[PDB]
Structure formats: C-alpha cells, structure tokens
Amino acid sequence: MFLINGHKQESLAVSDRATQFGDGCFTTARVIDGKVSLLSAHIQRLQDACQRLMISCDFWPQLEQEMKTLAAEQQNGVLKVVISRGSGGRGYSTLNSGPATRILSVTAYPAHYDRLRNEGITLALSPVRLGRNPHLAGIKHLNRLEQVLIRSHLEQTNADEALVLDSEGWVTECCAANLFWRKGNVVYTPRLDQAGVNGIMRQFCIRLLAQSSYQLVEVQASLEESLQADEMVICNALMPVMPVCACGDVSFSSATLYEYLAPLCERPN
Amino acid sequence: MFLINGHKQESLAVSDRATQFGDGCFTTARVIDGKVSLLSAHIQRLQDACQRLMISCDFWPQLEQEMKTLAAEQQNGVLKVVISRGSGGRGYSTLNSGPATRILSVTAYPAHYDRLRNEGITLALSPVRLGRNPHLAGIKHLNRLEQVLIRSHLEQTNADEALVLDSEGWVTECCAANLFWRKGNVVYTPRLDQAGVNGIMRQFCIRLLAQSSYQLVEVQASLEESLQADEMVICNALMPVMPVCACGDVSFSSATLYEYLAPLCERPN
Numbered sequence: 001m002f003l004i005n006g007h008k009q010e011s012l013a014v015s016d017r018a019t020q021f022g023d024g025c026f027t028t029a030r031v032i033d034g035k036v037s038l039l040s041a042h043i044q045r046l047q048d049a050c051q052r053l054m055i056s057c058d059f060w061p062q063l064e065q066e067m068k069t070l071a072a073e074q075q076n077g078v079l080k081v082v083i084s085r086g087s088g089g090r091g092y093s094t095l096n097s098g099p100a101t102r103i104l105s106v107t108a109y110p111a112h113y114d115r116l117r118n119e120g121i122t123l124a125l126s127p128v129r130l131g132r133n134p135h136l137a138g139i140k141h142l143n144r145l146e147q148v149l150i151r152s153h154l155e156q157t158n159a160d161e162a163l164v165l166d167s168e169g170w171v172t173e174c175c176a177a178n179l180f181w182r183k184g185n186v187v188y189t190p191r192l193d194q195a196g197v198n199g200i201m202r203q204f205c206i207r208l209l210a211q212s213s214y215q216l217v218e219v220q221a222s223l224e225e226s227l228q229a230d231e232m233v234i235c236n237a238l239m240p241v242m243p244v245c246a247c248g249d250v251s252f253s254s255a256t257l258y259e260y261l262a263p264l265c266e267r268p269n
Numbered sequence: 270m271f272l273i274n275g276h277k278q279e280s281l282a283v284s285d286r287a288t289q290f291g292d293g294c295f296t297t298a299r300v301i302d303g304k305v306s307l308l309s310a311h312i313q314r315l316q317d318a319c320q321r322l323m324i325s326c327d328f329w330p331q332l333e334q335e336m337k338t339l340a341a342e343q344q345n346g347v348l349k350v351v352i353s354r355g356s357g358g359r360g361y362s363t364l365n366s367g368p369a370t371r372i373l374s375v376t377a378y379p380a381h382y383d384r385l386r387n388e389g390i391t392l393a394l395s396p397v398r399l400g401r402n403p404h405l406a407g408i409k410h411l412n413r414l415e416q417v418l419i420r421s422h423l424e425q426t427n428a429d430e431a432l433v434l435d436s437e438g439w440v441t442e443c444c445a446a447n448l449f450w451r452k453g454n455v456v457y458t459p460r461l462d463q464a465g466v467n468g469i470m471r472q473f474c475i476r477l478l479a480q481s482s483y484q485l486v487e488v489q490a491s492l493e494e495s496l497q498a499d500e501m502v503i504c505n506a507l508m509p510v511m512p513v514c515a516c517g518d519v520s521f522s523s524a525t526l527y528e529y530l531a532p533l534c535e536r537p538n
C-alpha cells in the first residue's frame with residue numbers, strides 16, 4: 001500500500017507527470033528498529049532535487065512525519081518516497097501544473113543484500129553509457145531508464161553490479177550504487193556534476209573519508225585508471241556498503257576501506 | 270478519461286514503472302475527421318520503442334482498434350498512447366515484470382497551434398543540452414525531464430520553441446518537435462542516433478524530401494552551421510509543420526520548403 005498526499009491509496013491519477021514523463025524525484029531509505037536511517041539527509045536531498053527540478057513544495061514537515069510513521073510501522077526494511085510535479089501543464093510545460101504529489105511506501109528489507117555482503121560484489125562493465133547533463137546530474141530524479149537498461153545488461157552477466165561510464169568514458173557509478181576505489185591512502189570517487197546520482201550513502205561516506213586520515217578525491221577517471229585500484233567499494237542507502245571482489249577479471253585484494261566504512265555506515269542518523 | 274488495458278480508468282497502480290522510472294514509451298497523434306492521422310506509423314514507432322526498451326507486447330491489434338475507436342469518438346484533436354513495462358521487478362530490474370500497460374486518451378486539438386501557424390515560429394537556443402545515449406536515442410520514451418527543463422527555460426524567453434543542442438554541441442531538435450533547415454536545394458535535419466526523438470512527422474518529411482528534388486541530408490551540425498540557413502522548419506505529428514521566422518535574432522527569409530511540406534503534411538495516412 002502507498003500513502004499519497006496524506007492518505008492510503010493504491011492508485012494514482014493517470015495525468016500525474018511522474019507517469020507521463022517521470023517528472024519528479026525520489027529517495028530510498030533504510031528503516032531500522034522503527035527509524036529512518038539518515039532521515040534528515042533523505043529529506044535534504046529530496047529538497048535539493050525538487051529545487052533543481054523547480055518543483056515547489058511546502059509539505060516537508062508533513063512528509064517527514066509521514067516517513068517516520070511508516071518507518072515505525074515497518075520496523076525494518078525499505079522506505080521509498082516519490083515526489084512528482086503532480087498533474088497539469090500543457091505538454092512538457094510546468095505552467096499551471098501542481099500541486100506536487102508525494103508518495104510513500106515501505107517494503108521489507110531485501111534478502112539478496114545480506115548474502116551479497118557475505119560473498120563480495122562482482123562488477124561488470126556496462127555497455128550502456130550515461131548521457132551527460134549537468135542540469136540533471138546528481139539528482140535522484142525519476143528518469144531512470146538508463147538504470148533499467150544498465151540493469152538488463154547486467155543480468156546478462158554473472159556480476160552483482162555494473163561499473164557505469166558516462167558518454168565521455170568517465171567512470172561514474174554503478175546501476176544502483178555509487179563507487180569508491182582506493183589506491184594506498186587515496187580514496188577516489190567519481191565527480192557527479194555531469195551524470196550519476198549523488199547518493200545519500202556516498203555523501204555520508206565522503207563526510208567520513210574527508211575527516212579521516214584517508215585522502216578523499218573526487219575525480220574524472222577512465223576505466224583503466226579506476227581498474228588499477230587496490231580496493232573497490234560500492235554504496236547506497238540500503239547496502240549500505242559492499243566490498244568488490246573484482247571488476248571484470250581484475251581482482252581486488254584489500255578490504256581495509258570496506259572494513260573501515262562498513263561499521264560506521266550502519267550506525268548513522 | 271483514459272482507457273487502460275481495455276477499460277475506462279482515471280487512475281493507475283502506483284507500482285507501474287511508468288510512474289516509478291518513466292519506464293515506457295508513448296506517441297502523440299493527430300485525430301482528424303474521426304481518423305488517426307498516420308496511424309500505421311504511430312503503431313510502428315511504438316513497436317520500435319517497445320523493442321528497443323525490451324518491452325514485449327502482443328496487444329498491437331487491440332491497441333490499434335482502441336486508437337481508432339477513441340479517434341472516432343473525439344473526431345478532432347489529439348490522441349495520446351502510453352505503453353509502460355507495467356509493474357514488477359526488484360529495483361530497476363525488468364525480471365518478473367509485466368504485463369505491459371497500455372494507456373490511451375484523446376483531448377481536443379490545441380488552440381495556440383493555429384495562431385502559431387499564422388504568425389511564424391520563433392526559436393530560442395536552449396541552455397539545456399541533451400545528454401547523448403545511443404541506447405535511448407530516437408525513441409519516444411517516457412524520460413522527458415530534459416524536455417520539461419528545456420520547456421521551462423523556453424518560457425523565460427519570447428520564443429515559441431527551442432533549438433536544442435546535445436552535450437557535444439550538435440543541433441538535435443526542438444523541445445517537442447524536430448527540425449529541418451534549408452540551404453538552397455539542400456535540406457538538413459540532425460542525425461538522431463545519439464539524442465533527440467525520431468518523430469513521426471520527421472520520418473514522414475524525410476520520405477517526402479527523399480523522393481523530392483530537394484537533396485535531403487542527415488547531419489551532425491553545429492549551431493553556427495544551422496544558423497546560416499535560408500529557411501528553417503520544425504515539425505511534430507500535431508503541427509504538423511511550422512515555418513520559423515527566426516532563431517535568436519538570425520532571421521530567415523524563405524518559406525518555400527515550408528510551403529512545399531505544409532500541404533503534403535496534412536493529407537497523409
């Protein structure tokens with residue numbers, strides 16, 4: 001079941017722009033012991049997404065309350081929030097559109113994630129390259145066809161996640177996670193000003209790494225560059241962090257970064 | 270009202286992937302005298318879009334019938350068809366998803382289009398550049414946030430449509446139309462293998478131009494290149510063709526291409 005604009009609903013108006021153009025944003029949070037993990041970060045990112053999408057909402061307080069209630073009910077699992085421009089406007093126009101739609105739901109915590117953690121992640125390079133567009137880069141908006149295509153190709157391999165490059169060849173992220181790789185004491189993560197999703201866990205990890213003795217760098221790196229790393233790690237709000245056994249057939253030996261982030265990534269806000 | 274999977278419905282399951290990721294495609298056709306103009310082309314393009322999106326549908330005959338019925342009812346106006354992967358799948362995965370959803374609706378023919386025809390189109394260069402992705406290029410898929418963003422910027426100007434470049438600087442199309450420009454006897458239109466939507470009217474016009482004495486060329490052209498044209502024309506299924514008075518402040522004097530296409534574009538299938 002879903003909570004739409006304050007009430008239980010299983011259906012949504014067909015005219016809603018999320019449906020027509022995926023005109024909106026979303027977030028996916030971890031629910032533990034009846035609490036939304038990293039709640040304020042999730043709210044904050046939805047606000048940045050709505051801002052960049054020019055979607056004006058004054059329901060943030062109600063949305064937070066709603067997220068906490070569903071979370072308390074679910075206790076453990078996944079909490080998804082979707083915000084769209086709503087209905088209206090002629091064609092692609094946002095004029096006369098609104099008010100924004102808010103959709104909340106929770107599901108139990110996935111099963112495959114735990115096993116994936118106790119066996120390591122295997123990455124496969126994706127043939128689908130992300131188009132570059134600074135106007136949409138970073139935002140967890142609803143146009144995720146690229147991710148659906150990346151995922152479909154990924155299933156054609158034995159890898160658990162994909163290594164996704166952008167149209168210029170720059171390593172950007174995974175299908176549904178962000179990526180970090182380490183070279184000695186330098187930890188690298190792709191700059192997401194041109195493509196990819198600036199995840200909640202990525203931001204959390206960057207804050208950790210920044211303050212840590214690890215030197216964190218946001219780069220524009222080629223596949224070969226990233227593939228000469230001692231260790232590789234991927235993350236998202238639900239994992240929250242996973243060690244990468246290998247990308248393609250390039251094996252990674254270390255897991256110290258992973259061992260450093262893992263414990264810290266399951267005790268946040 | 271909408272016709273979803275064979276029946277009148279005003280709402281759609283929230284779980285539908287069109288809503289979650291804009292995971293689908295659509296088409297917008299002109300309805301005249303109770304007939305869907307260029308019907309077979311519209312069906313054919315929906316099939317190519319579903320094919321490229323790996324959305325398997327066996328409802329083409331029913332969808333066509335449905336389109337003709339709604340069209341006969343509406344008599345004159347716009348007929349929109351949306352096809353999505355439906356519901357299902359874990360995350361972005363298409364595995365175990367389906368069956369596909371089909372959504373049909375018709376609305377009266379817009380008012381502004383006619384005036385726009387009897388006054389000329391003014392184009393404004395768009396600051397939003399289309400990301401490039403051959404896996405999605407050409408398809409009229411549901412990820413149209415780029416178009417929503419292009420449109421919002423366009424409204425900040427006095428132009429009727431936008432001139433849209435891709436991330437490499439190549440002229441690609443308009444916000445909701447394709448573009449052709451003429452230089453003497455050579456008619457140019459951007460190649461859409463990297464971005465943009467391969468429209469039904471563009472394909473119709475290319476078939477006309479090909480067989481005509483006009484030399485038609487699909488190119489990769491810079492803004493400056495396109496802006497040194499004698500005439501500029503834009504098209505979509507509903508216009509169906511419009512003369513461009515000027516792009517920015519670069520005026521166009523001729524309208525012979527337009528006069529040649531206009532009459533022929535309102536008598537097709």
Ligand SMILES: Cc1ncc(COP(=O)(O)O)c(CN[C@@H]2CONC2=O)c1O
Binds near residue numbers: 173201
């Ligand atoms: C393409 C993409 N990149 C990165 C991320 C990571 O961001 P968070 O750290 O904020 O989660 C996600 C989110 N994926 C959620 C997490 O799991 N499934 C999702 O759709 C994503 O879809």
Ligand SMILES: Cc1ncc(COP(=O)(O)O)c(CN[C@@H]2CONC2=O)c1O
Binds near residue numbers: 443466470507
């Ligand atoms: C971005 C974009 N480019 C080109 C086209 C043209 O294709 P057709 O010739 O098949 O229509 C459209 C369609 N726009 C329809 C037509 O009007 N509004 C739409 O959304 C479009 O949205």
